Amino acid sequence: MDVVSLDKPFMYFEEIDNELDYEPAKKLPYQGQLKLLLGELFFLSKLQRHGILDGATVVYIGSAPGTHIRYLRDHFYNLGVIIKWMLIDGRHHDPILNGLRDVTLVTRFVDEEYLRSIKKQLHPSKIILISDVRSPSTADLLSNYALQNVMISILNPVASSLKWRCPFPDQWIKDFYIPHGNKMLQPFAPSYSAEMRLLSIYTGENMRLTRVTKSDAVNYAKKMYYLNKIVRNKVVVNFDYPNQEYDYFHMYFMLRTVYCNKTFPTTKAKVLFLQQSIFRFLNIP
Numbered sequence: 001m002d003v004v005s006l007d008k009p010f011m012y013f014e015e016i017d018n019e020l021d022y023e024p025a026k027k028l029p030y031q032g033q034l035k036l037l038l039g040e041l042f043f044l045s046k047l048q049r050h051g052i053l054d055g056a057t058v059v060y061i062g063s064a065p066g067t068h069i070r071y072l073r074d075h076f077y078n079l080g081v082i083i084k085w086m087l088i089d090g091r092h093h094d095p096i097l098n099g100l101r102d103v104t105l106v107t108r109f110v111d112e113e114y115l116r117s118i119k120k121q122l123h124p125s126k127i128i129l130i131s132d133v134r135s136p137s138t139a140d141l142l143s144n145y146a147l148q149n150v151m152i153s154i155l156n157p158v159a160s161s162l163k164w165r166c167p168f169p170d171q172w173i174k175d176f177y178i179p180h181g182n183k184m185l186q187p188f189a190p191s192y193s194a195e196m197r198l199l200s201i202y203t204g205e206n207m208r209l210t211r212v213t214k215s216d217a218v219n220y221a222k223k224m225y226y227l228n229k230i231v232r233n234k235v236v237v238n239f240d241y242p243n244q245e246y247d248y249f250h251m252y253f254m255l256r257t258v259y260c261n262k263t264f265p266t267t268k269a270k271v272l273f274l275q276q277s278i279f280r281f282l283n284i285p
């Protein structure tokens with residue numbers, strides 16, 4: 001058994017302290033909704049901590065089916081946070097999202113022109129952007145990242161969460177810029193996934209971008225390979241929890257930052273609660 005003792009999990013890309021030469025997917029049902037729910041609950045909890053969530057309109061682009069979004073919506077709604085949800089996708093959403101006055105579902109694939117009309121329509125509310133659009137090829141990726149930057153420039157949000165996976169070095173097309181932000185690592189991501197989420201909060205009227213080159217691509221690939229191949233396969237023996245696999249240890253850390261109405265005697269009790277709550281909601285054993 002791959003046993004180990006760990007202080008804390010790697011929460012952001014930058015934390016990974018090792019790499020592996022990438023060698024050329026899921027153990028749980030609804031694992032994808034889980035992966036998404038944890039990251040977005042983590043992101044939104046942070047904004048709440050900063051006082052920038054209440055009264056904002058959450059514009060989620062590439063939100064369908066969005067089964068897990070119902071849970072996120074209920075969570076903040078039950079906490080008393082006032083948020084309007086605007087879920088836009090060309091595909092249809094899970095019907096559990098229907099019939100809620102605080103959530104507007106839009107069946108539209110967004111283009112730059114559309115962003116301008118919704119910006120005019122959302123005005124003067126403050127916007128929190130969440131993007132999970134998916135076309136893939138390096139060209140498909142770049143195009144998605146290009147669109148995500150136009151979302152921020154037009155919508156001009158107070159914070160953003162963007163889907164982010166660096167293209168493979170051996171499939172490099174050109175250097176590009178992505179918004180400056182924290183590269184949040186995702187527990188329960190596919191076995192060999194190199195995807196993370198870019199979380200940014202916008203101050204003043206500036207927009208800081210960062211260039212990404214092929215050498216960065218090589219680094220992303222090796223660090224993400226060691227994390228997937230070695231780290232995620234660890235059994236944290238010093239983690240006193242029903243499940244000691246690395247992903248549960250990693251999940252505990254994101255869930256411990258979440259706010260609940262119900263008071264708990266220990267962080268462990270809360271996490272156990274939120275997790276039970278989350279798994280029951282997702283119908284995961």
Ligand SMILES: Nc1ncnc2c1ncn2[C@@H]1O[C@H](CSCC[C@H](N)C(=O)O)[C@@H](O)[C@H]1O
Nearest residue numbers: 062063064065066089091109110132133134
């Ligand atoms: N330009 C665009 N505007 C809106 N949605 C887009 C888009 N291009 C692709 N998409 C959508 O992006 C989605 C990627 S899968 C998204 C899953 C969703 N976040 C969930 O929680 O279940 C697809 O549903 C696709 O239709």
